[PDB]
Design an enzyme around this catalytic site. Structure first.
Site: not given
Ligand SMILES: CCCc1cc(OC2CCNCC2)c2nc(Nc3ccc4cn[nH]c4c3)ncc2c1
Length: 253
Positions: A16-17, A19, A22-23, A130
């Site tokens: 998804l992301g 950094g 990590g990822e 944040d």
């Molecule tokens: C403490 C919380 C940790 C955490 C972190 C995440 O990472 C995202 C942070 C914000 N920027 C992108 C990554 C999470 N992402 C998703 N879904 C998600 C993320 C990105 C996209 C793009 N298209 N569809 C997507 C769905 N769901 C739960 C998440 C939980």
């Protein structure tokens, strides 16, 4: 350690992301439940510190906050496992073409949903530090939940940070209200960046002069008023999140 689970019961699928620390991956728990997995790249961050986010999340639970389900800590790369949100960040959503179609009514809804989650945080005597659109996630159901609690307590986003915080390290729930006003600007502009065409350094300087972002072409007078409430120099004079939820809910009707 009732939140511990076997690494075997987690499969990673899509990243998804990415950094430096990590990822983040979408995955499945026991093949049934889709989840999000935060990966710790060892070396870049200590294990204990990376986990304090999860430790904090065990304490905080609410329907407008991203729910922790489990963690994986015994083996080399460490996981944190949360509920999956289908549409990613509120920023990704608003910027995406689907979010472009969305109109003011729902933007106010998003606004209020966030204020509600923050009303929980204030009730529980915490601070997020944040608070911004990138750290608010969106479900298929179009519900909003506050996600990243890395900086939450019982690097800082300079353009979302209150003047007293920047100047005197004085982060409080009122600092988060400031940030919420800035979050509003992110929402109403469909994901645009605060203080457009300015550096962080510029903003810090500008805030010492008493600068505030003028109203946006879209933003209604009565919403702009809410933003401006959040941005009062004296922290004491800013509203509560409880109050913000109210006024944001009644704006709807
Ligand atoms: C403490 C919380 C940790 C955490 C972190 C995440 O990472 C995202 C942070 C914000 N920027 C992108 C990554 C999470 N992402 C998703 N879904 C998600 C993320 C990105 C996209 C793009 N298209 N569809 C997507 C769905 N769901 C739960 C998440 C939980």
């Amino acid at each position: 350690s009732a939140w511990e689970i076997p690494r075997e019961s987690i499969k990673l699928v899509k990243r998804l992301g990415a950094g430096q620390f990590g990822e983040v991956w979408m995955g499945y728990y026991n093949n049934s439940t889709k989840v999000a997995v935060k990966t710790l790249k060892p070396g870049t961050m200590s294990v204990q510190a990376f986990l304090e986010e999860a430790n904090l999340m065990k304490t905080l639970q609410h329907d407008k906050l991203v729910r922790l389900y489990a963690v994986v800590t015994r083996e080399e790369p460490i996981y944190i496992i949360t509920e999956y949100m289908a549409k990613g960040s509120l920023l990704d959503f608003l910027k995406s073409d689907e979010g472009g179609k969305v109109l003011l009514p729902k933007l106010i809804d998003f606004s209020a949903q966030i204020a509600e989650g923050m009303a929980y945080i204030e009730r529980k005597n915490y601070i997020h530090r944040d608070l911004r659109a990138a750290n608010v996630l969106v479900s298929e159901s179009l519900m909003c939940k506050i996600a990243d609690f890395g900086l939450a307590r019982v690097k800082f986003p300079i353009k979302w940070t209150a003047p007293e915080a920047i100047n005197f390290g004085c982060f409080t729930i009122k600092s988060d209200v400031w940030s919420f006003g800035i979050l509003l600007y992110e929402i109403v502009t469909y994901g645009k960046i605060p203080y457009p065409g300015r550096t962080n350094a510029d903003v810090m300087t500008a805030l010492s002069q008493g600068y505030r972002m003028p109203r946006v072409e879209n933003c209604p007078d009565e919403l702009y008023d809410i933003m401006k409430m959040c941005w009062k120099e004296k922290a004491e004079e800013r509203p509560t999140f409880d109050y913000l939820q109210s006024v944001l809910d009644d704006f709807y009707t």
